Structure formats: C-alpha cells, structure tokens
C-alpha cells in the first residue's frame, strides 16, 4: 500500500494518494512503522493548501516518539523542526520552545536549526 501511495504522489494524483496512505496505516501491525508515513502524509496535506488539517497528523507522529520512550528517529526530527517553525507563526513561543529542545539530538543541520529557533523563542518567552 505504501508503494502505491508513492506512485500516486509522483504522478500528480494528490487526492488519491491521501486515501492510499490512510489504508496503509490501518494494515500496519505496529504503530512505530507508521512514523515514516505520517510525515509524508502531512506533506501531501501541505501541498493541498490546508495547513490546519496537517497539524493533527503532526501531533501523532511526534507523540509516537514519546510513546516509544524517546525513539528519536530521523523522520520525527523533521517533524519537530517543521512543527516548531509553524508554532512561531502562531505566536505561541512557549509551546514551541520544548519542541526544539527535544529534537536537539538529530543531525548536524537538525540541531543547529532547532538551536537558533530555541534562542528566538526564548527571547520572546
């Protein structure tokens, strides 16, 4: 099912690719395997100009990390960086500060992106 979603995504059929990934999520036996799908699924909603809808899926992918005693995986690193960036535009600096700190153990570019964001929100905190 996940492969079918990629083909639809690559052919400009965003309306169908949304439904394809949701079916894949149910078939997965373990929640941890849904970490990769959630981030890509959130991106497709971002291409479907509705930023509010993709927030709920961004909550779930990030929350899986907490439910897995801090899995700290790569595809959640991009989730926290994107989530914190949007929270700055929402004016809630306090709710965005912890997101940067939690992702401070990723790649070289990941940590610096959150570190500068941490300084920005701390000043307005």
């Amino acid at each position: 099912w996940q492969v079918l979603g990629e083909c639809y995504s690559k052919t400009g059929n965003k309306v169908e690719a949304i439904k394809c990934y949701k079916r894949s999520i149910k078939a997965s036996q373990t929640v941890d395997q849904n970490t990769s799908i959630y981030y890509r699924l959130a991106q497709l909603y971002e291409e479907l100009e509705d930023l509010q809808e993709c927030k709920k899926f961004m909550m779930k992918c990030v929350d899986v990390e907490e439910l897995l005693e801090g899995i700290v995986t790569d595809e959640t690193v991009k989730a926290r960086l994107w989530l914190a960036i949007f929270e700055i535009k929402a004016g809630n600096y306090q709710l965005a500060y912890d997101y940067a700190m939690g992702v401070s153990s990723g790649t070289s570019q990941e940590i610096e992106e959150a570190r500068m964001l941490a300084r920005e929100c701390r000043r307005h905190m």
């Binding site: 500068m116 300084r119 920005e120 000043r123």
Partner: protein, 57 residues
C-alpha cells in the same frame, strides 16, 4: 579587503538589528562600535584605520 569584509558582514546579517541571538547581536554591535570609536595615540598593527569604513559600513 576590509571594505569587502565590512559590506560582507552587513549583507549577511541584513535586517537583524530590529531586536528590542539578541545577546550575540548586542555583542557584535558593541564590538563594531568599539572598533569605530576607539582612539589610539599609537598606531596598532592589527587594528589600523583602514577597517573604520568597514566597521561603519
């Protein structure tokens, strides 16, 4: 070369001064002001007057 360095520093951090990073911007600002306002009775080798325009720019 110092004029090029001054314009370089100014262009990289364009629009970073409207702060009410702030600590580090304040440190950089006070360092540049120290460069532009320092008066030396004896010419120091590694801070000549050639960098004044770059600090000002």
């Amino acid at each position: 070369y110092r004029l090029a360095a001054g314009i370089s520093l100014g262009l990289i951090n364009l629009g970073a001064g409207q702060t009410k990073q702030n600590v580090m911007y304040e440190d950089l600002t006070t360092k540049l002001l120290e460069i532009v306002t320092s008066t030396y009775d004896v010419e120091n080798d590694w801070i000549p007057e050639n960098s004044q325009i770059g600090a000002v720019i």
